[PDB]
Chain length 260, copies 6
């Protein structure tokens, strides 16, 4: 059952192509410190680069929890908010990020959940925002992007009233993808991933970047461009342009197929 | 049961922190004239300023109706369309606006419903657009913003076919938040409001402005900025900047915590 | 049962105000070649102009299929991708375009389905994207616009896992408008259309352009502008502006009603 | 020569179709207060309604000054934003006539107005970061869509002062004239606008807002779209059939492609 | 020197990779009609398909004129918009060669084209609000994203005429040359473009549109993305496995971060 | 005079609040590599954290050069984009000090930085379409929001070189000075910024990004919004009530309209 790489507050493991970032703080119910986030960013950064991995999954250690948010009940000392760096990271990574929620995903923990491409929910799961009850709020991806899933009314609902939502309430609003019994959530998530690795990783990275460019204006278009520049690089045409530079002569795009 | 402030075609009342704007034209089934809208704008403007109120609710007088739209079956005389001024107002107000629909919310009446942050629906409620049957249309918030709740297909549906939608059909598409029996709709709405007043009014005003900035481009960002400028005003740093102006000397932002 | 206009791979028919574009390639399960698309574009272009038609419907020949996508199992010879020209066309046409799916709507076939204003689904229908399984993807309207119906999570789902979705799964996510037994799908769609032709065609063209301007930034606003310029043209004010040009004298917008 | 309806902290005037809103606080370099803004909101709203008003001009009292922001010396929350928002929902063109210092929330007002005519002694710039505020709304984003991001980021970061000619070359102001001719020119501009159709004008205005204000600017464009729709015979007959309790017949009205 | 395929109201020519669309109605100052636009839509679509065409130029017949809008003298609905839309979905650079009056829907056409080379006798401006129309689409919003909102609001509100140098300083045109050298320069521009890669060009073009056209401009960017994807070995093998009725093996193809 | 923490392919320095990132590869005209970019990402991230750093300057080693893109001579995927993205999420103003050739992905870097101060010998332009790449992200769209679409489409299509004064008139650079005074001026700019409040600065920076970066730029604006919220007494008391296991009392804290 999956290998492992050295971390203090998180777990970074691997199963047959899947990378698994796990929040390993069940005592505090998987709440993150600045160090925790910094470890997650590092873990994802390595997951992005490793050619062996095709799909990433984010989850909590045991049952009962996925993530809680902050706490203080950081290191540096400096009031960091690197939580937001991670938010951006998982959705620029040209690999699907799946949230395997197996309990409470509340506050900051839920925002990490919504920013993940897909969500596998255990029947045990409870979703919600706690910000305005705990003197906080995620007004970025936690608000705008949430509306882009559930509809404005529901997003307005979960932030204002701050209620809890069971797996079925989450499924019924479209927040989560499937709900499976707690025992089966370690499976199913793998079945999902196994289903992705059948498909072209390059087609998936474009579609991910296309979905980001839908919402993130000119920051999302950057990702689309970078994947384009990457594919364009691999074309015989581009080779000619950089060969002519090393050959100090003029480029000859004379005989190359021009598509209407 | 709630106090009151002087109005001719609407009712402006108050219950334990809640302000209640009521369309008082049940004879014409709560349709608005230019005067009605002008009263509603005034009522909301006062609701925005009054430090005693935390949540606003919009509703119709008795049962059977929430709102119908226009009529002519205005004052000035001048063909006003101030209906749109109100639309903008309720969503710049740093207080949640809840639509307590207790019957027909059709035509212009439904657009007022959708622009309200949350919607409490009585089982009695019927929703729809009548524009293209009555030689009209709301192509602004009535179209674009509607899609941002129900999905484009459903928004396209309700405008083209102009069908009626019962409380459950409304709930199933995500248009409304909850459906409660007609007898209980005066409650529940209060329970909702009572639940908001537990949370930080400042966190809520930012989240509201964040949800507007999601859709309203640079007009929504203005609201976000204004709330920022408001909170920045309250910080010791800002005080120093305006003190130095009244003291005619140079500002000293030397010893103030700089966050990464 | 409906007349007809000359085409090789598609059918262009007419019923009491409804135009019916039919993909006539059931042998290949209604997959399109470049010629097929070019015929569809022509058909729609004629449907746009013909004052007799009020609503357009897109569908496949027999049962079992709506559309499959590409194939090669074009003419010119030139690798065309005119599929995208059609995508833009049906949503600039000032007439509702209804997708009458009576079977498989997969791959490119589903994208044509989602771009259609409304969708009438037969119980027989199966929806899905096959791109990353067949070395392709629609990262434009197939990704972004899809999220604007079903929510990001579901759009992310159907592209990454590439699963099939039955009529009810489609209805439950909001992708399709209604589901009716296969026998009744030729009706119902007509009932829908008959319901549109009761309403003002001009109010509908604005609302369509308003829904496009919601998502398509400055390309959608063009459509809104063009409909505006069209209605403004019909006003006595505009007449005066162009009369003064033909009369070589100065325009007199002196006595014309100015609305606040 | 100019007809008046008075206030306490502003001046409100009419001249041959032109309505002129004037800040009347030169001693404090024409700075606004909560109250001064409230008066402007009112005067603009009245100008919105007046059928004889076709163009609105915002100006300072004498020379030397136009607007130097909000002074705070007279819990203060911020209705300048409502005014900015208002003065671009007015279906009437509004021209900024700057004849001195236009700084802080005084400059953002200049920016928000459709066009700016500047007397040669004009001074443009921000104070925000030095005085304990900022205009992160139209003061920042919208300024970039006039001046360009590189230059818009400049004015906010350095808070320097810019003379009339510098404003012209970056693109902040439309025109620059001598101080003596600035009461004129503006009237010429107004005279030139008033001979074009107010409806086409109000639409283009909405089209410019919709380009940037997203869905809120769309409401403006659509709002003026439905007004034109009201005036058509296929619209009124839709409303008449409802009044007469019968099915509407749009059937015989010219279609368009 | 220039090879021709003819029409009734336009001229369509080829020269060493350069295709030239020319309005052929100088008597009415090169104004378009429904028919004239239809011809341009066709000629552009043919230019879209021609593998030997790398750059497109839009110009007027002689000097004096380029385009003065739609005359209406020959129910008229408005296909100019389809043409505007078309001439920015062409994966080929299109340069406006203006040698006289470019006004009304004639100026918006100039605006829509990627670049504008101007002969020194060029005159730019709008007529809309005076003649009973407006271009609230690319005529308004897109013009602001070239000229800046302050100046874009100017040209529509006042409907004044602007000489070549004024257009240059606000940023409307790329370059200004003497009338004699305007047939040249444009060819030089074309010659310069034709030596760069057409694929990188078509992408940047789509990136510029996507920046402003929202989701529609995204379709363009993505559309060119999937074309490049078609030409890769991991794409064709995906399509081949479908044809051969077996499971696709993308497994051994280089990954990227 | 300047204090150093070293790397292999860059230089990283501090001077009275100013941190200076310098590409240290003049032999290849200051071109970056995957590694050189990684170093810059690190150095910027360190500058992000340093409480004593208020302004960041990006520059080339000597004169003649600033950045000429990515050379590729030393599967290469493209972390320059991460750096571009990073250097606009830094709540600190970053100024491009260009003293030579700024071309290709070297020019886009210049563009991404908030402001550009240019030595008179500066040369700006793109190489993409000729060398087998393009910057369809901030290189294209964002460049238009500085220069204007007409001119932004020019630089990419023709790939010409532009001197310092030409960059100034189109609006690419903020200021132009003699080469000798470019180490100065930049420091003056920095000195001028460092006397304004860092919080108002970081907000305006986020407001400028949010204007263009859509929902991602919104995250930045909101992120700085919640930081200010943390420092308020009604926020901490919300967090304290959670720690103390009791119901929060926001009830007695001043409200705003
Ligand atoms: C900048 C930042 O850092 C903040 C952010 O922006 S992110 C948003 C902040 N979010 C929050 O504070 C969420 C509040 N937490 C909750 O609501 C939790 O669900 C809650 C404690 C009720 C836990 O629910 P639960 O299942 O009933 O667990 P419960 O029985 O209450 O408590 C178990 C332990 O979890 C800890 N815990 C759970 N969530 C926590 C959190 N977010 N912070 C700190 N501790 C937390 C509790 O303190 C408790 O620890 P102890 O045994 O030492 O007292
Ligand atoms: C610019 C503008 O002003 C217009 C706009 O943009 S807003 C859009 C305009 N909307 C409309 O016109 C909606 C049309 N109204 C409806 O469909 C109503 O539901 C409708 C009259 C059927 C009422 O439904 P109902 O429950 O069956 O009530 P019903 O039995 O029909 O009639 C009861 C009374 O309500 C009145 N009424 C209801 N809605 C009305 C409306 N919108 N305008 C005028 N009168 C209305 C009816 O005229 C009737 O009055 P009388 O007794 O004097 O004849
Ligand atoms: C640029 C482009 O052109 C491509 C694009 O961008 S659009 C996206 C491309 N999409 C696809 O390729 C979709 C793949 N097709 C499918 O998945 C089909 O549903 C699929 C063949 C399984 C058909 O499902 P089905 O109901 O079981 O039909 P099935 O029994 O498998 O086969 C029946 C016939 O349909 C044909 N067919 C169905 N879809 C086809 C397609 N997309 N292309 C070619 N042939 C297709 C099969 O080849 C078969 O023909 P034969 O009898 O000559 O072998």
């Amino acid at each position: 059952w999956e290998t492992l790489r050295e971390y203090d507050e998180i777990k970074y493991e691997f199963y047959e192509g899947i990378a698994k970032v796990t929040i390993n703080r069940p005592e505090v119910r998987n709440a993150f410190t600045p160090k925790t986030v910094a470890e997650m960013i590092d873990a994802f950064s390595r997951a992005r680069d490793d050619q062996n991995v095709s799909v990433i999954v984010l989850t909590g250690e045991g049952d009962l929890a996925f993530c809680s948010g902050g706490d203080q009940k950081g290191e540096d000392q400096i009031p960091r908010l690197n939580v937001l760096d991670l938010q951006r990271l998982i959705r620029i990574i040209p690999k699907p990020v799946i949230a395997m929620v197996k309990g409470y995903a509340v506050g900051g923990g839920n925002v990490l959940n919504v920013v993940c491409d897909l969500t596998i929910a255990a029947d045990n799961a409870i979703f919600g925002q706690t910000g305005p009850k705990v003197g906080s709020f995620d007004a970025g991806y936690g608000s705008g992007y949430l509306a882009r899933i559930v509809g404005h009314k529901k997003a307005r609902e979960i932030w204002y009233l701050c209620r809890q939502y069971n797996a079925q309430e989450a499924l019924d609003m479209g927040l989560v993808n499937t709900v499976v019994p707690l025992e089966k959530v370690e499976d199913e998530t793998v079945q999902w991933c196994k289903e992705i690795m059948k498909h072209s990783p390059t087609a998936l990275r474009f579609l991910k970047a296309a979905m980001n460019a839908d919402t993130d204006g000119l920051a999302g278009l950057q990702q689309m461009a970078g994947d384009a520049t990457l594919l364009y690089y691999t074309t015989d045409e581009a080779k000619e342009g950089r060969d002519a530079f090393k050959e100090k002569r003029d480029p000859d795009f004379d005989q190359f197929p021009k598509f209407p």
